[PDB]
């Protein structure tokens, strides 16, 4: 006779959360005894997804970063179901799913998002009489003060340029007034429009020069990787490191002997700090799924407060889902995520770029060399192609 059991795939890209995602899936299956959900985790998942979609083999539910060119192009080509009118989308913070809309239609549920800022050692700031900086000038002074008191302000991963993507995007964002303004200056300006003499460029150079203050970085930072800086920070060897919300689990796993805080990178004046990030646990549904009711039931389940709470309690990334109890003001990510999901939480600028690695490289190369005109030249070289 007939069987009704159906399997859907959930194509995961959050490998760090596989255990909890699998538990969730088992809870979903106990509530829905006729649905089986396969949590797919493969190496090189981004590239595998591209291969599968191109082949016409799209997973039923897909973890896809909604800032990506792939979400944009695939959503346009009809690869994903229009979620705009789903009741469960109402559980996402007002306005936030809409930041990745395509042709005014939402194709992805952003459960969580990353953010970026400065990790710092609360204990040593307290011992040294130091405060979170609220302007560019205070952040310079903070770094100098730390050096003067015989400690090392930053762990910088000179060998992993990507770690400074957020830092330089926020330097531009704060210099220009926001994310769209920063992309106006960099991306949607005229070819070769970026000039050393520009006030914007001067301000960007100021913010970047905070990372160039004499004595500001650990010895051999040039060669240091992400893991090295996570370790230096956890050991108390450096007082701060610029990075994203994704670093916390690794920091905690190093068992620091101090309380971790975070702060937003300030603007020129008080009350002008910003952060940057995008959807992380973020799902779309195939438009060609053989089992749309079950695929939607899985996505709906994860939007429930008691289900997302299971994920959040472990992962800690800010969540856009209603009803979740987020961590308090003393939690390590509090400063970084104070303004999550607001106008002060910009979507990564590369939403509207055709690549990003070369921006990482020009950023870190400036930290290395201090060659200001070279940096301007590198910025025009990277953005000019985008402007044809
Ligand atoms: Na059947």
Short mmCIF file of C-alpha atoms and ligand atoms in Angstrom, two decimals:
data_model
loop_
_atom_site.label_atom_id
_atom_site.label_comp_id
_atom_site.label_asym_id
_atom_site.label_seq_id
_atom_site.Cartn_x
_atom_site.Cartn_y
_atom_site.Cartn_z
CA UNK A 1 0.00 0.00 0.00
CA UNK A 2 0.85 3.63 0.19
CA UNK A 3 3.54 5.04 2.58
CA UNK A 4 3.57 8.58 3.30
CA UNK A 5 7.03 9.06 4.89
CA UNK A 6 9.06 11.69 3.01
CA UNK A 7 12.64 12.87 3.40
CA UNK A 8 13.79 16.41 2.89
CA UNK A 9 17.38 17.65 3.02
CA UNK A 10 18.57 20.54 5.13
CA UNK A 11 21.85 21.74 3.49
CA UNK A 12 23.78 23.14 6.44
CA UNK A 13 26.70 25.56 6.37
CA UNK A 14 27.00 26.08 10.18
CA UNK A 15 29.27 23.13 10.88
CA UNK A 16 30.01 24.32 14.39
CA UNK A 17 26.37 23.84 15.27
CA UNK A 18 25.77 20.42 13.77
CA UNK A 19 25.18 18.74 17.10
CA UNK A 20 22.47 21.15 18.19
CA UNK A 21 20.95 21.26 14.72
CA UNK A 22 20.73 17.50 14.76
CA UNK A 23 19.08 17.55 18.17
CA UNK A 24 16.55 20.08 16.85
CA UNK A 25 15.89 17.92 13.89
CA UNK A 26 15.20 14.92 16.15
CA UNK A 27 12.80 17.04 18.21
CA UNK A 28 11.07 18.06 14.88
CA UNK A 29 10.86 14.45 13.84
CA UNK A 30 9.25 13.39 17.22
CA UNK A 31 6.53 16.01 16.63
CA UNK A 32 6.10 14.96 12.98
CA UNK A 33 6.57 11.13 12.91
CA UNK A 34 6.09 11.04 8.97
CA UNK A 35 8.89 13.49 8.11
CA UNK A 36 12.59 12.80 8.07
CA UNK A 37 15.07 15.57 7.80
CA UNK A 38 18.66 14.80 6.55
CA UNK A 39 21.15 17.40 7.87
CA UNK A 40 23.78 17.60 5.14
CA UNK A 41 27.27 18.80 6.08
CA UNK A 42 29.94 18.51 3.43
CA UNK A 43 33.40 19.97 2.94
CA UNK A 44 33.57 23.00 0.75
CA UNK A 45 29.88 23.44 1.22
CA UNK A 46 29.62 26.76 -0.65
CA UNK A 47 31.17 25.35 -3.75
CA UNK A 48 29.16 22.09 -3.49
CA UNK A 49 25.94 24.13 -3.28
CA UNK A 50 26.90 26.08 -6.39
CA UNK A 51 27.56 22.74 -8.20
CA UNK A 52 24.21 21.26 -7.04
CA UNK A 53 22.13 24.31 -7.95
CA UNK A 54 23.74 24.56 -11.37
CA UNK A 55 22.95 20.85 -11.95
CA UNK A 56 19.34 21.49 -11.15
CA UNK A 57 19.64 19.58 -7.86
CA UNK A 58 18.64 22.03 -5.14
CA UNK A 59 18.40 20.86 -1.48
CA UNK A 60 14.89 21.21 -0.02
CA UNK A 61 16.00 23.64 2.64
CA UNK A 62 19.24 25.51 2.25
CA UNK A 63 21.44 27.45 4.64
CA UNK A 64 22.53 30.25 2.29
CA UNK A 65 24.07 33.54 3.35
CA UNK A 66 21.58 36.04 2.23
CA UNK A 67 24.10 38.76 1.39
CA UNK A 68 25.61 36.54 -1.20
CA UNK A 69 25.62 37.03 -4.97
CA UNK A 70 24.33 33.47 -5.17
CA UNK A 71 21.21 34.23 -3.15
CA UNK A 72 20.66 37.27 -5.37
CA UNK A 73 21.14 35.55 -8.70
CA UNK A 74 19.38 32.30 -7.69
CA UNK A 75 16.39 34.15 -6.16
CA UNK A 76 16.06 36.09 -9.43
CA UNK A 77 16.21 32.86 -11.49
CA UNK A 78 13.39 31.27 -9.46
CA UNK A 79 15.45 28.79 -7.57
CA UNK A 80 13.82 29.57 -4.16
CA UNK A 81 10.21 29.73 -2.90
CA UNK A 82 8.87 33.30 -2.24
CA UNK A 83 8.45 33.39 1.60
CA UNK A 84 7.13 36.94 1.68
CA UNK A 85 3.67 35.94 2.86
CA UNK A 86 4.51 33.13 5.25
CA UNK A 87 2.96 33.67 8.74
CA UNK A 88 6.22 32.40 10.27
CA UNK A 89 8.20 35.25 8.67
CA UNK A 90 6.35 37.61 10.96
CA UNK A 91 8.52 36.18 13.75
CA UNK A 92 11.60 37.85 12.27
CA UNK A 93 12.47 41.32 13.58
CA UNK A 94 10.67 43.92 11.59
CA UNK A 95 12.52 44.99 8.52
CA UNK A 96 15.44 42.57 8.81
CA UNK A 97 14.49 39.80 6.31
CA UNK A 98 13.71 42.62 3.90
CA UNK A 99 17.31 43.73 3.73
CA UNK A 100 17.96 40.78 1.46
CA UNK A 101 14.78 41.01 -0.55
CA UNK A 102 15.07 40.51 -4.30
CA UNK A 103 12.55 42.38 -6.45
CA UNK A 104 10.77 43.17 -3.20
CA UNK A 105 10.25 39.56 -2.33
CA UNK A 106 11.83 37.74 0.66
CA UNK A 107 13.45 34.40 -0.09
CA UNK A 108 15.35 33.72 3.16
CA UNK A 109 14.64 33.58 6.88
CA UNK A 110 17.52 35.05 8.86
CA UNK A 111 17.40 33.39 12.20
CA UNK A 112 20.70 34.72 13.38
CA UNK A 113 23.24 37.30 12.12
CA UNK A 114 26.85 38.00 12.83
CA UNK A 115 28.29 41.29 14.04
CA UNK A 116 31.77 42.81 14.29
CA UNK A 117 33.61 44.90 16.81
CA UNK A 118 36.44 44.86 19.38
CA UNK A 119 36.86 42.15 21.94
CA UNK A 120 38.46 43.43 25.16
CA UNK A 121 39.63 42.24 28.53
CA UNK A 122 37.29 43.75 31.12
CA UNK A 123 39.56 42.78 34.02
CA UNK A 124 42.60 44.56 32.67
CA UNK A 125 40.64 47.60 31.57
CA UNK A 126 39.37 47.81 35.18
CA UNK A 127 42.83 47.24 36.70
CA UNK A 128 44.34 49.92 34.39
CA UNK A 129 41.56 52.46 34.74
CA UNK A 130 40.61 52.25 31.10
CA UNK A 131 37.21 52.80 29.44
CA UNK A 132 35.52 51.80 26.25
CA UNK A 133 36.22 54.50 23.68
CA UNK A 134 33.32 56.52 22.26
CA UNK A 135 35.11 58.45 19.48
CA UNK A 136 38.00 57.79 17.05
CA UNK A 137 40.17 60.12 19.10
CA UNK A 138 39.41 58.20 22.38
CA UNK A 139 40.17 54.89 20.66
CA UNK A 140 43.65 56.28 19.53
CA UNK A 141 44.23 57.48 23.06
CA UNK A 142 43.21 54.17 24.54
CA UNK A 143 45.74 52.33 22.44
CA UNK A 144 48.50 54.77 23.34
CA UNK A 145 47.55 54.54 27.04
CA UNK A 146 47.78 50.73 26.98
CA UNK A 147 51.24 50.88 25.36
CA UNK A 148 52.36 53.43 27.96
CA UNK A 149 51.26 51.07 30.74
CA UNK A 150 53.41 48.23 29.32
CA UNK A 151 50.80 46.07 27.78
CA UNK A 152 49.98 45.20 24.18
CA UNK A 153 46.71 46.71 22.84
CA UNK A 154 45.89 44.35 19.95
CA UNK A 155 46.26 40.89 18.55
CA UNK A 156 46.34 41.32 14.82
CA UNK A 157 46.36 38.28 12.51
CA UNK A 158 48.64 39.65 9.87
CA UNK A 159 48.55 36.40 7.94
CA UNK A 160 44.70 36.36 7.88
CA UNK A 161 43.69 39.65 6.24
CA UNK A 162 40.00 38.72 6.31
CA UNK A 163 39.97 39.36 10.06
CA UNK A 164 40.14 43.16 9.31
CA UNK A 165 37.33 43.21 6.69
CA UNK A 166 34.84 44.40 9.31
CA UNK A 167 37.28 46.91 10.74
CA UNK A 168 37.92 48.75 7.47
CA UNK A 169 34.26 48.55 6.34
CA UNK A 170 33.33 50.24 9.64
CA UNK A 171 36.07 52.79 9.20
CA UNK A 172 34.41 53.80 5.91
CA UNK A 173 30.86 53.42 7.36
CA UNK A 174 31.60 55.71 10.28
CA UNK A 175 33.52 58.20 8.07
CA UNK A 176 30.63 58.45 5.59
CA UNK A 177 27.50 58.09 7.85
CA UNK A 178 26.39 54.58 7.11
CA UNK A 179 26.56 51.51 4.90
CA UNK A 180 24.84 52.92 1.86
CA UNK A 181 26.99 56.05 2.18
CA UNK A 182 30.15 53.97 2.42
CA UNK A 183 29.21 52.02 -0.67
CA UNK A 184 28.37 55.29 -2.39
CA UNK A 185 31.89 56.48 -1.85
CA UNK A 186 33.63 53.23 -2.73
CA UNK A 187 31.42 51.20 -5.08
CA UNK A 188 28.89 53.48 -6.80
CA UNK A 189 31.22 56.50 -7.33
CA UNK A 190 32.85 57.13 -10.64
CA UNK A 191 35.85 55.24 -11.80
CA UNK A 192 39.04 56.54 -10.07
CA UNK A 193 36.93 58.78 -7.86
CA UNK A 194 38.73 57.78 -4.70
CA UNK A 195 41.53 60.24 -3.96
CA UNK A 196 44.03 60.58 -1.17
CA UNK A 197 42.97 64.25 -0.64
CA UNK A 198 39.32 63.27 -0.05
CA UNK A 199 38.16 64.06 3.50
CA UNK A 200 36.55 60.59 3.61
CA UNK A 201 39.86 58.99 2.73
CA UNK A 202 41.64 60.99 5.35
CA UNK A 203 39.18 59.80 7.99
CA UNK A 204 39.51 56.19 6.82
CA UNK A 205 43.30 56.54 7.06
CA UNK A 206 42.87 57.94 10.61
CA UNK A 207 40.82 54.95 11.72
CA UNK A 208 43.21 52.47 10.05
CA UNK A 209 46.17 54.25 11.67
CA UNK A 210 44.86 53.25 15.08
CA UNK A 211 46.17 49.79 14.19
CA UNK A 212 49.57 51.30 13.27
CA UNK A 213 50.31 53.07 16.58
CA UNK A 214 53.80 52.28 17.79
CA UNK A 215 53.68 49.22 20.08
CA UNK A 216 50.04 48.51 19.33
CA UNK A 217 50.42 44.92 18.05
CA UNK A 218 51.94 41.67 19.30
CA UNK A 219 55.41 40.62 18.18
CA UNK A 220 55.45 38.85 14.81
CA UNK A 221 51.83 39.91 14.15
CA UNK A 222 52.84 39.93 10.44
CA UNK A 223 52.89 36.14 10.56
CA UNK A 224 50.06 35.52 12.92
CA UNK A 225 46.88 33.71 12.01
CA UNK A 226 43.35 33.95 13.35
CA UNK A 227 43.94 31.04 15.84
CA UNK A 228 47.10 32.72 17.11
CA UNK A 229 45.25 35.94 17.93
CA UNK A 230 42.36 34.07 19.59
CA UNK A 231 44.93 32.41 21.79
CA UNK A 232 46.84 35.62 22.56
CA UNK A 233 43.67 37.34 23.56
CA UNK A 234 42.42 34.41 25.72
CA UNK A 235 45.84 34.25 27.53
CA UNK A 236 45.76 37.96 28.29
CA UNK A 237 48.81 38.57 26.13
CA UNK A 238 46.88 41.30 24.21
CA UNK A 239 44.06 43.42 25.62
CA UNK A 240 41.83 43.57 22.51
CA UNK A 241 41.31 42.02 19.13
CA UNK A 242 39.05 43.16 16.27
CA UNK A 243 36.80 40.39 15.06
CA UNK A 244 33.37 39.08 14.56
CA UNK A 245 30.74 37.50 16.81
CA UNK A 246 31.81 34.17 15.39
CA UNK A 247 35.00 34.12 17.49
CA UNK A 248 33.40 33.82 20.93
CA UNK A 249 33.17 30.01 21.12
CA UNK A 250 36.85 29.62 20.17
CA UNK A 251 37.85 32.32 22.71
CA UNK A 252 35.87 30.61 25.44
CA UNK A 253 37.33 27.23 24.56
CA UNK A 254 40.78 28.65 25.38
CA UNK A 255 39.55 29.13 28.98
CA UNK A 256 40.42 32.80 29.56
CA UNK A 257 41.12 33.85 33.16
CA UNK A 258 39.16 37.12 32.75
CA UNK A 259 35.77 38.44 31.75
CA UNK A 260 35.38 39.15 28.07
CA UNK A 261 33.63 42.18 26.76
CA UNK A 262 33.04 43.72 23.41
CA UNK A 263 32.64 47.26 22.06
CA UNK A 264 31.47 48.78 18.86
CA UNK A 265 33.96 50.64 16.76
CA UNK A 266 33.20 54.34 17.45
CA UNK A 267 32.58 57.12 15.06
CA UNK A 268 34.12 60.54 14.95
CA UNK A 269 31.72 61.85 17.63
CA UNK A 270 29.93 60.12 20.50
CA UNK A 271 26.86 58.10 19.64
CA UNK A 272 28.00 57.33 16.10
CA UNK A 273 29.28 53.75 16.52
CA UNK A 274 28.25 51.10 14.07
CA UNK A 275 28.55 47.37 13.52
CA UNK A 276 28.36 45.23 10.40
CA UNK A 277 27.24 41.65 9.75
CA UNK A 278 24.65 39.53 7.93
CA UNK A 279 22.46 36.45 8.22
CA UNK A 280 24.33 33.38 9.46
CA UNK A 281 21.71 30.66 10.34
CA UNK A 282 19.64 31.72 7.39
CA UNK A 283 17.44 29.43 5.37
CA UNK A 284 15.79 29.31 2.00
CA UNK A 285 13.46 26.72 0.50
CA UNK A 286 13.81 25.21 -2.95
CA UNK A 287 11.07 26.32 -5.40
CA UNK A 288 11.27 22.85 -6.97
CA UNK A 289 11.12 20.83 -3.78
CA UNK A 290 8.94 17.70 -4.14
CA UNK A 291 7.74 18.29 -0.55
CA UNK A 292 6.98 21.92 0.06
CA UNK A 293 4.58 21.42 3.03
CA UNK A 294 7.22 19.48 4.95
CA UNK A 295 10.05 21.86 3.96
CA UNK A 296 7.95 24.79 5.25
CA UNK A 297 7.10 22.89 8.44
CA UNK A 298 10.81 22.52 9.15
CA UNK A 299 11.52 26.19 8.64
CA UNK A 300 8.47 27.12 10.71
CA UNK A 301 9.66 24.90 13.55
CA UNK A 302 12.99 26.70 13.78
CA UNK A 303 11.16 30.07 14.05
CA UNK A 304 9.45 28.95 17.28
CA UNK A 305 10.84 30.66 20.36
CA UNK A 306 11.54 27.47 22.30
CA UNK A 307 13.37 25.93 19.31
CA UNK A 308 15.48 28.91 18.36
CA UNK A 309 16.33 29.29 22.09
CA UNK A 310 18.06 25.89 21.91
CA UNK A 311 20.29 27.09 19.14
CA UNK A 312 20.90 30.55 20.56
CA UNK A 313 21.90 29.32 24.04
CA UNK A 314 24.83 27.39 22.41
CA UNK A 315 25.80 29.64 19.51
CA UNK A 316 25.22 33.05 21.01
CA UNK A 317 24.97 34.93 17.76
CA UNK A 318 22.22 37.57 17.94
CA UNK A 319 18.84 36.29 16.79
CA UNK A 320 16.16 38.14 14.85
CA UNK A 321 13.48 35.67 16.12
CA UNK A 322 10.69 36.96 18.45
CA UNK A 323 10.39 35.53 21.90
CA UNK A 324 13.97 34.31 22.41
CA UNK A 325 15.56 35.27 25.69
CA UNK A 326 18.89 36.81 24.73
CA UNK A 327 21.88 37.06 26.96
CA UNK A 328 22.24 39.84 29.39
CA UNK A 329 24.40 42.96 29.50
CA UNK A 330 27.29 41.16 31.10
CA UNK A 331 27.56 38.55 28.33
CA UNK A 332 30.71 38.81 26.17
CA UNK A 333 28.87 39.90 23.00
CA UNK A 334 26.69 42.52 24.69
CA UNK A 335 28.59 45.56 23.45
CA UNK A 336 28.98 44.26 19.97
CA UNK A 337 25.32 43.30 19.67
CA UNK A 338 23.61 46.13 21.58
CA UNK A 339 22.29 47.47 18.30
CA UNK A 340 21.83 44.23 16.41
CA UNK A 341 19.00 44.35 13.92
CA UNK A 342 18.79 48.14 14.02
CA UNK A 343 19.95 50.86 11.66
CA UNK A 344 23.32 50.70 13.42
CA UNK A 345 23.86 47.06 12.29
CA UNK A 346 24.81 47.40 8.67
CA UNK A 347 24.77 44.57 6.18
CA UNK A 348 28.25 43.67 4.90
CA UNK A 349 29.22 46.04 2.13
CA UNK A 350 30.16 43.14 -0.17
CA UNK A 351 26.52 42.49 -0.65
CA UNK A 352 26.97 44.92 -3.47
CA UNK A 353 30.57 43.97 -4.52
CA UNK A 354 31.67 41.30 -7.01
CA UNK A 355 34.36 39.93 -4.68
CA UNK A 356 35.97 40.76 -1.35
CA UNK A 357 39.39 39.16 -0.86
CA UNK A 358 41.23 42.05 -2.47
CA UNK A 359 39.63 44.45 0.01
CA UNK A 360 40.94 42.29 2.83
CA UNK A 361 44.38 42.36 1.26
CA UNK A 362 44.57 46.15 0.73
CA UNK A 363 43.43 46.65 4.35
CA UNK A 364 46.11 44.46 5.88
CA UNK A 365 48.75 45.68 3.43
CA UNK A 366 48.13 49.21 4.78
CA UNK A 367 48.56 47.96 8.36
CA UNK A 368 51.85 46.49 7.21
CA UNK A 369 53.25 49.33 5.09
CA UNK A 370 51.49 52.58 5.89
CA UNK A 371 51.52 53.42 2.21
CA UNK A 372 48.53 55.73 1.96
CA UNK A 373 48.66 56.42 -1.80
CA UNK A 374 49.18 52.75 -2.41
CA UNK A 375 46.06 52.00 -0.47
CA UNK A 376 44.07 54.53 -2.51
CA UNK A 377 45.46 53.00 -5.69
CA UNK A 378 44.46 49.49 -4.43
CA UNK A 379 40.95 50.73 -3.61
CA UNK A 380 40.45 52.11 -7.19
CA UNK A 381 41.94 48.95 -8.67
CA UNK A 382 39.48 46.81 -6.69
CA UNK A 383 36.32 48.96 -7.28
CA UNK A 384 36.96 50.13 -10.92
CA UNK A 385 36.02 46.82 -12.46
CA UNK A 386 32.76 46.85 -10.60
CA UNK A 387 31.91 50.24 -12.16
CA UNK A 388 31.70 48.87 -15.75
NA1 LIG B 1 2.33 7.79 -0.50
#
